[PDB]
Amino acid sequence: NATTFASVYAWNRKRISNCVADYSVIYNFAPFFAFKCYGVSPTKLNDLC
Amino acid sequence: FTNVYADSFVIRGNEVSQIAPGQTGNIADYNYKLPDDFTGCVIAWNSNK
Amino acid sequence: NDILSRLDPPEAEVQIDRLITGRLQSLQTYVTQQLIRAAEIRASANLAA
Numbered sequence: 001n002a003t004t005f006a007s008v009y010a011w012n013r014k015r016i017s018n019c020v021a022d023y024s025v026i027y028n029f030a031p032f033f034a035f036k037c038y039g040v041s042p043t044k045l046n047d048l049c
Numbered sequence: 050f051t052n053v054y055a056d057s058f059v060i061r062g063n064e065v066s067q068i069a070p071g072q073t074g075n076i077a078d079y080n081y082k083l084p085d086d087f088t089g090c091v092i093a094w095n096s097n098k
Numbered sequence: 099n100d101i102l103s104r105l106d107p108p109e110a111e112v113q114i115d116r117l118i119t120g121r122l123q124s125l126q127t128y129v130t131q132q133l134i135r136a137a138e139i140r141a142s143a144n145l146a147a
Contacts, residue, residue, distance in 0.1 A: 048103060
């Protein structure tokens, strides 16, 4: 949640340093449309580093 | 066959594809869960009128 | 173990079973070679007797 982001031609590829986060911060947005994920199933993106 | 179970309900058009197994949607959330084998079938039609 | 923490139980059975087959074929190649190697050992033991 921020101001109006850039278009697809400009990528804000962000390096996230050492920190501690969970899915509660992600969960703040109900209008999630594309919830499809690969690699790890979305029910277990917690308690693994 | 052995025994058939028919279940009828009313959902929206964007929720029709959410009845597919092995995925999560508005219907495949905590509202409804369905077994991954699914020997049965899903048939849906318009009821606009 | 990490595969179990990685993916859902419907999917990745296609990754489990190929690893099952590749290991049981290794067992098959091992015990076939063992039954081969026991044959001349038995013949040599009979000759020694």
